[PDB]
Amino acid sequence: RTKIVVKVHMPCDKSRAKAVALAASVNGVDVVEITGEDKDRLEVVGRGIDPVRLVALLREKCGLAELLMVELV
Amino acid sequence: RTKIVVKVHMPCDKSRAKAVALAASVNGVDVVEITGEDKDRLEVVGRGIDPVRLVALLREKCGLAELLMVELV
Numbered sequence: 508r509t510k511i512v513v514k515v516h517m518p519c520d521k522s523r524a525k526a527v528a529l530a531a532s533v534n535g536v537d538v539v540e541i542t543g544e545d546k547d548r549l550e551v552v553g554r555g556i557d558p559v560r561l562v563a564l565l566r567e568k569c570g571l572a573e574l575l576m577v578e579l580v
Numbered sequence: 581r582t583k584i585v586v587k588v589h590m591p592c593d594k595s596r597a598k599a600v601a602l603a604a605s606v607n608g609v610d611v612v613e614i615t616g617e618d619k620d621r622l623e624v625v626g627r628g629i630d631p632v633r634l635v636a637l638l639r640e641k642c643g644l645a646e647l648l649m650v651e652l653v
Contacts, residue, residue: 520639524632524647531582531631531650540649 508554510578513562516571583625584650589643606634
């Protein structure tokens, strides 16, 4: 249903993993993937996602989260 | 159930083999497969896997590993 693209502070490859894993646990999330040429963005797909609570949770635990694009399909 | 995809440094078939094996041992893994055009990615399926412990386990023993996607089947 919804495709979210959020930019996350993920310095090393271990913070990538735990960020990819946090979004995975949000309700409604079917899939998370790393993306962007700087490998600094997550793409989150699912149905019924709350984009605000998602990005907030990323920002609390990572230090930065910015919602870039919300797409419907 | 949960499926995840790790890109792992695996130059030769020997190291490919060691990598597939070592992913198979972390807890919750049902299946481990090799994939990608360049046979550089491992897809591991199971339930209850910790992604970061897994990719850290691979990075520790294979040099570098990146978590590319995680999917909730």
